[PDB]
Amino acid sequence: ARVTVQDAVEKIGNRFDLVLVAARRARQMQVGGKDPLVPEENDKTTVIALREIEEGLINNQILDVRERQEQQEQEAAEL
Amino acid sequence: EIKELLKLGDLPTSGQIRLYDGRTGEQFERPVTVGYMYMLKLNHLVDDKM
Amino acid sequence: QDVVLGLYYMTRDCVNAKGEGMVLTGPKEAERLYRSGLASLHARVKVRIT
Amino acid sequence: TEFLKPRLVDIEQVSSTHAKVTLEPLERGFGHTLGNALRRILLSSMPGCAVTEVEIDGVLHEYSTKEGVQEDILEILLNLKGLAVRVQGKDEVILTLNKSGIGPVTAADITHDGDVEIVKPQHVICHLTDENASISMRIKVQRGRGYVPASTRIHSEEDERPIGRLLVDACYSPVERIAYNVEAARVEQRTDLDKLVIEMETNGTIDPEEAIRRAATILAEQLEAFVD
Amino acid sequence: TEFLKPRLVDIEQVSSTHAKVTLEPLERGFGHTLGNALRRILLSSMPGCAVTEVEIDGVLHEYSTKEGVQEDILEILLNLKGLAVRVQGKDEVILTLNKSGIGPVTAADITHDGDVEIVKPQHVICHLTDENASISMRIKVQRGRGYVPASTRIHSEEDERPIGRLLVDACYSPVERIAYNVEAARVEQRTDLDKLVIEMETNGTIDPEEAIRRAATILAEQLEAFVDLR
Amino acid sequence: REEAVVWDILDEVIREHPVLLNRAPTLHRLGIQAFEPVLIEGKAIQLHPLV
């Protein structure tokens, strides 16, 4: 979270992998513009990414599946 | 000689007095040493270093 | 260095000091007794703790 | 020249009787003035009613012993200190405790005058091991203020106290703990200002908030005498 | 609940400045509770009048000098900071000092307004060493509390002063030193009552009784938040 | 110009934004640590004693 990221590390299992996943999600929320899954609570997108990973709402597989779902739906909207 | 001087000015020959705290107003438990030390402002002004 | 001297001065003891051997109902009234000035910071005492 | 009147921002009730009161902003160096003046008044001058003496049948000393009671006599007196009594009419009451059998002797089992209330009926005075053992004692609730330990009384009063008047520290003041703490208020106007945080905690006889109000009401009255 | 309230007994004015004001009778444990809150308020913030700007004739900045004047304009400004005035009615006055001839220029030579009292008229402002020398200066005296440095003012002031208006730092507060002793009072039955003796040392601009009245007023105003809580 | 809205924008942009403090010589990896700033009125960095 804000002070310690231990819970996120136990949820992913690797400091480095946690950084990569959290950066991907924060990029989604900062540029991609999509809404957070936890309340804002006046935090920078980085910390919302960490908080979401703390609750198990965001895992690398979850990010992959959401991205694939949206991309396949756009490809369906092509036709 | 230091202590003969401290006795001349009616000061604690131990050179160490009872200080009260400024905020809570209650005495510091055990005596503190107080006296005039000569300090020098050096040339390391944070204005020039920041 | 300063924090360790603070901890050492507070968690120490004396032969006969203010509040020598009274019983306290916990840590909170130990703090109350010290602040009130009724017991010295380091004075042997029986306190119930959980 | 009305100085800086603050705004109570946070009333964090952590428990039914333990609170945090955050109060910002104050003129620089007023956090300590107010916090310490309060803390001192709350610690050493708030009035309340507290147990002061106990006569236990079959006992003459605190270091003596009683069979059937799991606790020592010393632990019994210690349990009596943390008794939250509240008297309504008078400045002295004599309660009696009489229990028999097996089970915890909670405060709910005290013979009560109608005008004397007990805040915590679940405060365990002592335990009973054997069913043939019973406990009888005569407790003295007294009204006062501050905190007067046992030694002060035992050396102050010379009157012939009958053998059996085991003597208890009197926690008259209803404040279990108070600790203030002064942070810095980041105000656009000036940052030199400071904010006060008061972790208050009482016994149940009074709420924390009523306790702070009563403390402020005491100091105000003393200063009213000389404010003009 | 038998709280006995205190009452200013007398002002033991030892010296022109030293005043051992007595304050009795107090409950046990209140001599310090009042005493320290007072001391902090009296020394923390009390209102007084201080020289804020100076303006000497034909002087552009304080790092210069004057002909016939033994001090630099900086030493004159340091001698002016410690000017102890008492402004009766208004809130900002402008005094004028004009003197010529050999001798010390003291604060007794300020052409006094009607409602401006200089309590130490022997406070040497400056020295003139030439018979043809002359100093003419317009000293602005404000009222406030605390210590306001000149830099804070000029940063808070976007107005462009003329080149020649020297800017003195402002130490408004009149109370210099203050101590107290909690002695034991004498009452017919209550022997646990106290009495508080506050010794104040000032510039001579605040009257001790009025100083304590202001301090008690500030404390009572501030405690209103806790009394009428939320 | 340092308007008073610049300071509000600064306190908004500095929240949750870690900043690396370094001291040379950097003998070991604990010589460069990321803190989280608190804006203070002065010209000297303020360091937690324990670190």
Side-chain angles (χ1 to χ4, degrees), chain A residues 17-33:
Chain A
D17 210 327
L18 158 71
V19 166
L20 283 199
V21 174
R24 176 176 172 180
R25 170 62 188 176
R27 191 74 35 80
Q28 282 183 348
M29 268 150 53
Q30 183 175 28
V31 168

Side-chain angles (χ1 to χ4, degrees), chain C:
Chain C
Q1 79 182 9
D2 191 0
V3 64
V4 74
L5 172 59
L7 270 299
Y8 171 91
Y9 187 85
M10 90 172 288
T11 74
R12 207 174 148 171
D13 80 290
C14 204
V15 180
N16 260 87
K18 293 179 179 179
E20 204 51 47
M22 41 160 82
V23 299
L24 315 185
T25 176
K28 272 182 277 307
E29 80 172 3
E31 196 185 10
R32 272 219 316 287
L33 282 191
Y34 173 46
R35 296 289 181 163
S36 297
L38 297 177
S40 181
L41 183 47
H42 57 277
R44 296 185 299 240
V45 160
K46 284 172 131 303
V47 311
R48 179 208 312 279
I49 63 170
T50 82

Side-chain angles (χ1 to χ4, degrees), chain D residues 29 33 40 209 221 225 227-228, chain E residues 5-6 33 40 213 217 229:
Chain D
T33 317
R40 280 186 64 95
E209 295 294 328
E221 293 177 350
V227 175
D228 289 345
Chain E
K5 317 276 158 208
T33 310
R40 271 176 76 76
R213 298 289 177 95
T217 306
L229 206 149

